[PDB]
Design an enzyme around this catalytic site. Structure first.
Site, PDB file in Angstrom:
ATOM      1  N   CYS A 223       0.802  -1.219   0.000  1.00  0.00           N
ATOM      2  CA  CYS A 223       0.000   0.000   0.000  1.00  0.00           C
ATOM      3  C   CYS A 223       0.841   1.277   0.000  1.00  0.00           C
ATOM      4  CB  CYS A 223      -0.930  -0.014   1.218  1.00  0.00           C
ATOM      5  SG  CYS A 223      -2.361   1.089   1.064  1.00  0.00           S
TER       6      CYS A 223
ATOM      7  N   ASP B 299      -6.459  -3.363  10.860  1.00  0.00           N
ATOM      8  CA  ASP B 299      -5.355  -2.430  11.017  1.00  0.00           C
ATOM      9  C   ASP B 299      -5.186  -2.079  12.495  1.00  0.00           C
ATOM     10  OD1 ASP B 299      -3.327  -0.672  10.362  1.00  0.00           O
ATOM     11  OD2 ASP B 299      -4.547   0.472   8.940  1.00  0.00           O
TER      12      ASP B 299
END
Lengths: 200, 200
Positions: free
Chosen positions: B6, B124
Site C-alpha cells: 500500500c 489495522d
C-alpha cells in the site's frame, strides 16, 4: 511465476485456482468457444472471489461497444482480445481496461507485435484452446522486445522447466490443468503449483 | 500468501513491488493521508504495470459518489474503505467494484464484523498509517468466522511468522517496507519477499 487459469466456467474451479495462488482467472465471453460462460454467471462467480485476483474477460472479434458492455456486465477487470481486433479497437477498450492481445504462433513471432497496443502479448499455439503445444524457442523474437509476454499453448506441469526457463512475465494454462475442456482437475492444478514452488 | 503493498506514490516502487510478486498495490486517494497520491498519477503508474496485479484505491470517509469518481479517474479496480463508512456506502460502491473494509483494532476483533458487506475485511492498528502493530491473536475472533481477512498494522519482514501462522487471506504492508511514508525501500521490499519465499 505468475499464472493465469483461463476458461473458468464453475465456482468450484475458480476457488481452487485462487486458493492455489493464481494471479488471474479467465472468463470466456466469445460466442462459439468450448469454454464459453454467461456474463451474468461470470459475475456471480466474481462475487465469490477475493479482491486480490484479477478477473480477465476473453473476447473474439467483438466491437468495443460490445466488449465494454460485456466487461461491465460480468464485472471483469482486464480484456483479452483473442480474435483479430484492430489496434483501433484495442485502443478504445484499452481506454477503460488493461488489454492483453492474443497472437497465434505458426512459427516465429513477428517482433512487430511488440508494437501492438496492449499491456500484455499472449503467444498461443496454432489453434486457440486446442491444447496444441509448440517449440519453446518460437517465443524468442517477441520476448526479445522486452514487452510483457504471457506464454500459453499446451502448457502443463510436466514441461514447465522449458517455458519457465525463458523467464516470461506469466504463464497461461487451460488444457494442461483440465480433465475436460472447461473443467479443471484439482490434482492437475495441485501438482502444477506444487512443481512451481519446487522450481523456486 | 497474498501480499498487497500500500501507499504507492512512485512508479519505481510500483514496478519493484510488482516484480517481487505482489498481488495488489494500494493508491491512497484520501485527503489528509501521509501517503496520498494524485488520481491522475495513479492512472499513469497504472499504464506502466502488467495486467496481473490488482490496483487498489484507498479512501477514508468519502461518500460513494466521490469514491466512484476517483476510482474512475485513477482507473483502479478495488476500493478500500478505511474510515467509518456505513454498510450502505459499501453496498453502493460494491455495485461497481469489489470492496475491502478496514477495521482499526483496539482490542480483539468483533466476529459480527463478518456481516459487513465487503469482499474482504482488513484489520489495522488503532491508528491507520502509524505503522503501529498490535497483538496478532486479536485476529482470531474474525478469522474464525471463515471470511476473507487481510492483516495489516505494522507488518514487516521481521514479524512475518506470527501473522503467517494465522493463515489469513492476505497481508497488507506499508510502513514495514518504507524508508519514509509513501517512499518504499528497495532493500526492505526485497527482504520481505525473500523472507516469504523462505517461509513457504
Amino acid at each position: 511465476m505468475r499464472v493465469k487459469i483461463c476458461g473458468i466456467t464453475r465456482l468450484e474451479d475458480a476457488l481452487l485456482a485462487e486458493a492455489l495462488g493464481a494471479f488471474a482467472l479467465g472468463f470466456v465471453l466469445a460466442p462459439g468457444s468450448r469454454r464459453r460462460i454467461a456474463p451474468e454467471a461470470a459475475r456471480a462467480i466474481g462475487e465469490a472471489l477475493g479482491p486480490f485476483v484479477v478477473r480477465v474477460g476473453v473476447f473474439r472479434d467483438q466491437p468495443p461497444e460490445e466488449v465494454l458492455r460485456l466487461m461491465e456486465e460480468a464485472r471483469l477487470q482486464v480484456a483479452q482480445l483473442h480474435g483479430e481486433e484492430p489496434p483501433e479497437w484495442a485502443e478504445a477498450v484499452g481506454r477503460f481496461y488493461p488489454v492483453i492481445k492474443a497472437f497465434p504462433l505458426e512459427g516465429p513471432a513477428r517482433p512487430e507485435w511488440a508494437d501492438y497496443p496492449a499491456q500484455a502479448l499472449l503467444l498461443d499455439g496454432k489453434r486457440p484452446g486446442s491444447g496444441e503445444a509448440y517449440p519453446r524457442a518460437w517465443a524468442k523474437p517477441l520476448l526479445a522486445t522486452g514487452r510483457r509476454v504471457i506464454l500459453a499453448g499446451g502448457i502443463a506441469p510436466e514441461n514447465l522447466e522449458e517455458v519457465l526457463a525463458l523467464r516470461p512475465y506469466a504463464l497461461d494454462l487451460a488444457s494442461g490443468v483440465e480433465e475436460a475442456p472447461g473443467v479443471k482437475s484439482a490434482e492437475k492444478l495441485r501438482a502444477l503449483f506444487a512443481r512451481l514452488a519446487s522450481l523456486r
